[PDB]
């Protein structure tokens, strides 16, 4: 789902 990509970008850019 393209609408979930920015959530993954957020998660990986925190840590």
């Amino acid at each position, epitope marked *: *789902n*393209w*609408f*979930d*990509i*920015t*959530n993954w*970008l*957020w998660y990986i*850019k925190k840590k």
Partner: antibody
Amino acid sequence: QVQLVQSGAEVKRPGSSVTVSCKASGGSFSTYALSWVRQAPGRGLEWMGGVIPLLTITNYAPRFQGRITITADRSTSTAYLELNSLRPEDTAVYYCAREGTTGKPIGAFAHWGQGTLVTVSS
Amino acid sequence: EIVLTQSPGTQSLSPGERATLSCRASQSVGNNKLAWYQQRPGQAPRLLIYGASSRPSGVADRFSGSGSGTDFTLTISRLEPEDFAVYYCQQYGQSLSTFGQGTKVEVKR
């Protein structure tokens, strides 16, 4: 905080192409999803497509795949919609819309531009 | 493609009354990714509810969302004058996002 400002109204001839801009101020531009939604006179909202600038990842509605291009310029925090092969039924207000945050993104469109009227006419 | 049906398309109600607005999906909406928007004449839409039931800060708490799967509801506990507007549902549980056709909440007289 986040403000989306679109380019002004356009009159375009049938068969031409239109480009609408959306400049974002406040927030992070590269890692949040920007979509385009249109509304023909007296009709409902229609999602056309969107872009994630950082990855250059576009997502187009099948209805528009073949006539639409969405691009993003990280240097100016500006997104662009291009729609080709215009027909009178493309007359509409075109909105840019950016996802909200809880920040953690929510997918749903918290931030809307003011809209751009595109009139397709001879 | 997920088709969202908002029926009825118009509701005629009085100020102070409760409103419940239906959104029925043709297939299950992924992870309950269902949003509701308000739109007043000549204005851009405004997000009221996301994720079926989450309410952004700044949205009045007389608005609530519920439901899951294919059956979603927007509740307005008590209509204020500014609540007479058009309401759209949207699913974003698949890359092809779709909107319902809208329900207009108008004043009965």
